[PDB]
Amino acid sequence: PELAVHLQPHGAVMIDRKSMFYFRLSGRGAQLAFLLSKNKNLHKTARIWEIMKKEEMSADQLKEELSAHPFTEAWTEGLLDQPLHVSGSLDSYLPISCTLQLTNACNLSCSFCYASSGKPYPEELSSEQWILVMQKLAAHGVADITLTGGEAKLIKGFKELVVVASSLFTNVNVFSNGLNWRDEEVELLSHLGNVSVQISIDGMDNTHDQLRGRKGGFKESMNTIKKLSEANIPVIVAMTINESNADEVSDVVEQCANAGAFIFRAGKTLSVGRATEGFKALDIDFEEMVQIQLREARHKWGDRLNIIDWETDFCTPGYLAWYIRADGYVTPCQLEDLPLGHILEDSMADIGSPARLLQLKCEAKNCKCIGKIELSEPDLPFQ
Amino acid sequence: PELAVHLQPHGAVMIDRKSMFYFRLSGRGAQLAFLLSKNKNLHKTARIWEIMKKEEMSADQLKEELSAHPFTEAWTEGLLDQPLHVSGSLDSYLPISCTLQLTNACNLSCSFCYASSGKPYPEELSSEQWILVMQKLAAHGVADITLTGGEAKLIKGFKELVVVASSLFTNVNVFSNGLNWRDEEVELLSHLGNVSVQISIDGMDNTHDQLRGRKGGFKESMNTIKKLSEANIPVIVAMTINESNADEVSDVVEQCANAGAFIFRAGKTLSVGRATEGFKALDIDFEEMVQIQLREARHKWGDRLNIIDWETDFCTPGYLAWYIRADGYVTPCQLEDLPLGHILEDSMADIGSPARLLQLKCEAKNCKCIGKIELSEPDLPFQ
Numbered sequence A, B: 001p002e003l004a005v006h007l008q009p010h011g012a013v014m015i016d017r018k019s020m021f022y023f024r025l026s027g028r029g030a031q032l033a034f035l036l037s038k039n040k041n042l043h044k045t046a047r048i049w050e051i052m053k054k055e056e057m058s059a060d061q062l063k064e065e066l067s068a069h070p071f072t073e074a075w076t077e078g079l080l081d082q083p084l085h086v087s088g089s090l091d092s093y094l095p096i097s098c099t100l101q102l103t104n105a106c107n108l109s110c111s112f113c114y115a116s117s118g119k120p121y122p123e124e125l126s127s128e129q130w131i132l133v134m135q136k137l138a139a140h141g142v143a144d145i146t147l148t149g150g151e152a153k154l155i156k157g158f159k160e161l162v163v164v165a166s167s168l169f170t171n172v173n174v175f176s177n178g179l180n181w182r183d184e185e186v187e188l189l190s191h192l193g194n195v196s197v198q199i200s201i202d203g204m205d206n207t208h209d210q211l212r213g214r215k216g217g218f219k220e221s222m223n224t225i226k227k228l229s230e231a232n233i234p235v236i237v238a239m240t241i242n243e244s245n246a247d248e249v250s251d252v253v254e255q256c257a258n259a260g261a262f263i264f265r266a267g268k269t270l271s272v273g274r275a276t277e278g279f280k281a282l283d284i285d286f287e288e289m290v291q292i293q294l295r296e297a298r299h300k301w302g303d304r305l306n307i308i309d310w311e312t313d314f315c316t317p318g319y320l321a322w323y324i325r326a327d328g329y330v331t332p333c334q335l336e337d338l339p340l341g342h343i344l345e346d347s348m349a350d351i352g353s354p355a356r357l358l359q360l361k362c363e364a365k366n367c368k369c370i371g372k373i374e375l376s377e378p379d380l381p382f383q
């Protein structure tokens, strides 16, 4: 693991930047973690605690205390032996993960698209501006970046941008419809080494092609999955479910397994953007139909492919993750246009205002997760 | 080494956080460093460069390019194989080293004291406020902290504060007159492991005691040096030269070597604070007298003690190092009361304003280094 401690106004989190697992630290636990990362010795850390805190603590008591949870238990086995990166703020909520909508342009114009993509916004951040943004985010401790759109790789200067992303972040993911991939793009992402690709597949050939409005789209996108996987790029396949494709999940999973994909994830079509027109919620029969196929698929393909459960490493919207639109406005979530601020016009500290987050929590209509967030009781390191 | 890249408005620096050596990166060199830290392979990095830059580059050309300087040469030997910490800003100058004046209180009242120490300021930051400050500095990439005063360890809550400093920074140094050290303070700093102590010794017994106004001060302070060294704490001895002690340098060096000190540094008395009254610049005969003793001392004791040269790891005042006074005002240098800002009232970004730094560069009367600083031509990574 590549561990970091990220400070927040109500407490700190420890993050494994590689897996993006994170763990809410108690104030005491954070202090002990920092000590162990420095002196690397349970006896030394316990004795320091005794001196500074005027409280008895032996190495056995410290070991037993940390053995109370499997993650803190690893701190007694040398997990904290590498330098622990420090980031964040006690005064504002700064993210550990961001999703950057590089452009709203797209070669498709899917009738369900939550982003209403196809045409770019009249003014979008240039690749040079996104490179400025990424330097600011990385210097603030953002560890994980997703590049989306639209079709992200349509942005002029994409190659330089994705190199900057790879260089400045622990993990990069590029979301793509899988169309119009060039050999040197595959090669570039392969060599960069920390870039994954998420490809949308919405059915077998004919259903996918109808839903996406592209005859031959499935075959091209599946070929892209194969080329990426052959170049050792982790591929995540995202299938967005509706009444047309609900019965095709198991067949799609097989195709993805054969193509070498790493992860398969199915999700509902949400009533956002172009999908609002004529929206019908997935009724219960179709939802159960998906679930039985996911279960069957794990029995069959679970060895060769991670098949995600239908509906922590979840970065809480707004508090731990930001979505940055192609026009520069920052929101808690790719589904939400209610802004925290503007990435060029406002300071990082102002964007992460706790008061605004509370306001967005009660006013957001499209991100369903943010309204459900319950902050833990304040428990800060060092008091 | 524990390497970091710190962005500035005119270019980036690579820092070894352990030794505090740093190196101005060219924009190209910074890009190559990040790539090598990620894919860890000269062939992969060269090929990525070819694809993104549309310029030919083989592994041999990359190796030859980096072999042009001994530090970049190590990047072809795996120096960059651990995660590279990113910090800084393209819009303001943020420091990599800070010196925190925890209090202006002191048990002595030396007639030369640049800080005019003895009585605390009427309002000083509490240890709790300093702990808030340290979290902000560490989250902004400050790697190295010095705790000074006054006598820093007089601050209420010193033990908790120095533990926070050790926990949040790669290196901590505590400056002390060497008086009134408790056994558990020595033990605490020993166990923390990344804390050094700088002790002032201004002559042999009688000259030191006269200059410091403390009969028995030399014997007590030398005993502290011995206790600290016996506990494996690196001790730096600082001798501040005047006409009274200039001929005692070699004798002091011997005492410091015998006591186990790590570094000996002699410096001039500067016309700041209480020393302005009756100030006489060290004339040339006394300055040469010091130099001959330093030379003799290195011949004799250079094996057992680092004897610093009379008059990079020098962190440029204001641009790379901040001094934070006990009243919270930030200045470029411990000798200078001209402020960059206030650590509680102003944002980090506002304190490091490039325009204010230029103004301080031309208006500062007491820091002699800042006026001499010449910024290199702008050479930013990623354009």
Ligand SMILES: C[S@@+](CC[C@H](N)C(=O)[O-])C[C@H]1O[C@@H](n2cnc3c(N)ncnc32)[C@H](O)[C@@H]1O
Pocket (backbone or CB within 6 Å): A106, A112, A113, A114, A115, A148, A149, A150, A151, A152, A175, A176, A177, A178, A198, A199, A200, A238, A239, A240, A267, A268, A269, A270, A271, A272, A273, A275
């Ligand atoms: C906005 S697309 C951008 C990347 C790329 N153009 C693509 O389609 O894969 C990101 C993901 O959102 C999904 N998506 C689009 N509209 C949606 C909606 N209304 N509800 C749920 N997911 C949706 C897409 O199918 C895709 O998996």
Ligand SMILES: C[S@@+](CC[C@H](N)C(=O)[O-])C[C@H]1O[C@@H](n2cnc3c(N)ncnc32)[C@H](O)[C@@H]1O
Pocket (backbone or CB within 6 Å): B106, B112, B113, B114, B115, B148, B149, B150, B151, B152, B175, B176, B177, B178, B198, B199, B200, B238, B239, B240, B267, B268, B269, B270, B271, B272, B273, B275
């Ligand atoms: C301000 S003292 C604070 C720490 C502690 N009280 C001590 O004296 O070591 C830090 C250093 O500055 C030195 N110093 C004080 N006044 C000075 C002056 N006018 N010129 C040069 N150094 C000075 C001290 O001797 C000491 O080495």
Ligand code: SF4
Pocket (backbone or CB within 6 Å): A106, A107, A108, A109, A110, A113, A114, A115, A116, A117, A118, A149, A150, A151, A177
């Ligand atoms: S879902 Fe992806 S491919 Fe379809 S219009 Fe939206 S951005 Fe384009």
Ligand code: SF4
Pocket (backbone or CB within 6 Å): B106, B107, B108, B109, B110, B113, B114, B115, B116, B117, B118, B149, B150, B151, B177
């Ligand atoms: S030089 Fe150090 S010991 Fe002397 S008055 Fe100043 S702060 Fe106190």
Ligand code: FES
Pocket (backbone or CB within 6 Å): A316, A317, A332, A333, A334, A335, A366, A367, A368, A369, A370
């Ligand atoms: S994070 Fe916005 S809906 Fe889940």
Ligand code: FES
Pocket (backbone or CB within 6 Å): B316, B317, B332, B333, B334, B335, B366, B367, B368, B369, B370
């Ligand atoms: S840094 Fe101020 S005088 Fe040297």
Ligand SMILES: [Mg+2]
Pocket (backbone or CB within 6 Å): A207, A244
């Ligand atoms: Mg059908």
Ligand SMILES: [Mg+2]
Pocket (backbone or CB within 6 Å): B207, B244
């Ligand atoms: Mg004399």
